[PDB]
Design a protein around this ligand. Structure first.
Ligand SMILES: Cc1c(O)cccc1C(=O)N[C@@H](Cc1ccccc1)[C@H](O)C(=O)N1CSC(C)(C)[C@H]1C(=O)NC(C)(C)C
Lengths: 99, 99
């Protein structure tokens, strides 16, 4: 699909069998999701945002569906303003910028 | 053009007679640039995200040249870690997300 940017590029995603709203964010290297229960062990990770660096939990090979496209990859969990679908997954669903 | 997301989507921009590297960011509502001098009047504003909030100066009707496309809009100036081209200007150059 083609998504314009007159409004926030928010889509519905599915993780752990639950539907959630998330932002397609080309400015984010990673995918950051609000606090939730994910399977497996996690590793520590520092990500730097507009206001500085924070600590998040990194879960690898997590199954996640984006606007109908299934992806399997790294998902970070921590204090985020909104669910962020970053480049690591956008690339997986073949998302590109065009103008 | 079509830009992949394997790596940060950085482009060169010309703003206020200065050349700068900036990030095409679909997750950003606003355009935020590192400290620089800009014409016209301005007002304070607080913006926040992953690292929390930072205070910036809002300048309106600022012209920015991005990859050959001229765009006019509000530009925020402050202590941002990376120069950000947000949706307010991405729309003006006809930039869309595609997959
Ligand atoms: C989440 C993340 C990573 O895992 C890794 C690197 C950067 C970010 C990140 O937060 N990117 C940010 C901005 C940024 C990029 C590179 C360096 C520093 C900061 C972003 O893509 C965005 O527009 N976001 C993320 S959170 C948000 C939805 C509020 C919005 C935002 O900050 N918007 C304003 C700039 C308008 C505040």
């Amino acid at each position: 699909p083609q998504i314009t940017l007159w409004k926030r590029p928010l889509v519905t995603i599915k993780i752990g069998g639950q539907l959630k709203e998330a932002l397609l964010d080309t400015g984010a290297d990673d995918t950051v999701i609000e606090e939730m229960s994910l399977p497996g062990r996690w590793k520590p990770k520092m990500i730097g945002g507009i206001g500085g660096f924070i600590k998040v939990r990194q879960y690898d090979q997590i199954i996640i569906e984006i606007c109908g496209h299934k992806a399997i990859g790294t998902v970070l969990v921590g204090p985020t303003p909104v669910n962020i679908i970053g480049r690591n997954l956008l690339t997986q669903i073949g998302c590109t910028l065009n103008f």
